[PDB]
Write a protein that binds this ligand. Structure first.
Ligand SMILES: CC(C)c1onc(-c2c(Cl)cccc2Cl)c1COc1ccc2cc(-c3cccc(C(=O)O)c3)sc2c1
Lengths: 11, 229
């Protein structure tokens, strides 16, 4: 879950 | 009186906080698009979903943020999202930032499907926080303090956050006693608003319900961060 937030952090 | 470790912390922060992240072509719509309830709402959704990205990229830059438990990093973002957004808009209305198109942003918020029950408090909040006549450093320090709030629900290590927050409060307090010796109650007032800010989390949950039962669309990103089922 929260793959969008995770994706922004790892970006 | 602003040591080295601080004159440096502040500068790293004013550095991030100042990056012009929101694209001009995007915020320009606040001024150029038609003024109607639907369009006002779509534009406000676009500003907010874009702002979520600016926050994350600002938060990532906050000292030691990337060293926190990945689960807490989410809890903090999800917890401060609304508050940080009220702080940013407040700055738009208070210090009339050009990229915000203050008066036109206000026209769109006052006609985007929000009940008078929330519009009134909302603007009352903006007026009194403006009366604090804060500086960009205070706004920035304030936002960083809100984002790093060990208070937020679901936090797993409420002490590693406090530890990351402490330095910021210190630099804010200092900056207050420094250029605001006139009255040693300024630090307290700013912190007071934090309490008033919290009040809008509830209000925002109701605003989302209203918008939702009225078939309004948000974004995958806003829905995740605000937990919109
Ligand atoms: C989904 C949407 C309809 C919504 O639902 N509730 C709220 C809300 C409202 Cl009314 C009031 C307070 C808080 C929320 Cl959360 C919102 C609007 O949220 C936002 C969020 C961020 C920004 C940044 C802006 C902005 C403009 C120009 C320049 C800049 C800049 O940083 O330079 C920023 S406008 C803007 C609008």
């Amino acid at each position: 879950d929260h793959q969008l937030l995770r994706y922004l952090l790892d970006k | 009186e602003l040591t080295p470790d601080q004159q440096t912390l502040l500068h790293f922060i004013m550095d991030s906080y100042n990056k012009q992240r929101m694209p001009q072509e995007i915020t320009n719509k606040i001024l150029k698009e038609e003024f109607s309830a639907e369009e006002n709402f779509l534009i406000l959704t676009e500003m907010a979903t874009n702002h979520v990205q600016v926050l994350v990229e600002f938060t990532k830059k906050l000292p030691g943020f990337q060293t926190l438990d990945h689960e807490d990093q989410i809890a903090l973002l999800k917890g401060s999202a609304v508050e940080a957004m009220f702080l940013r808009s407040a700055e738009i209305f208070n210090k009339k930032l050009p990229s915000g198109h203050s008066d036109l942003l206000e026209e769109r918020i006052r006609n985007s499907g929000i009940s008078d029950e929330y519009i009134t408090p909302m603007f009352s909040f903006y007026k009194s926080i403006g009366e604090l006549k804060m500086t960009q450093e205070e706004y920035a320090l304030l936002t960083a303090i809100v984002i790093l709030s060990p208070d937020r629900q679901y936090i797993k290590d409420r002490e590693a956050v406090e530890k990351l927050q402490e330095p910021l409060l210190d630099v804010l307090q200092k900056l207050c006693k420094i250029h605001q010796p006139e009255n040693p109650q300024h630090f307290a007032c700013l912190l007071g608003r934090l309490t008033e800010l919290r009040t809008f989390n509830h209000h925002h949950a109701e605003m989302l319900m209203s918008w939702r039962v009225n078939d309004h669309k948000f974004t995958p990103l806003l829905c995740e961060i605000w937990d919109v089922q």
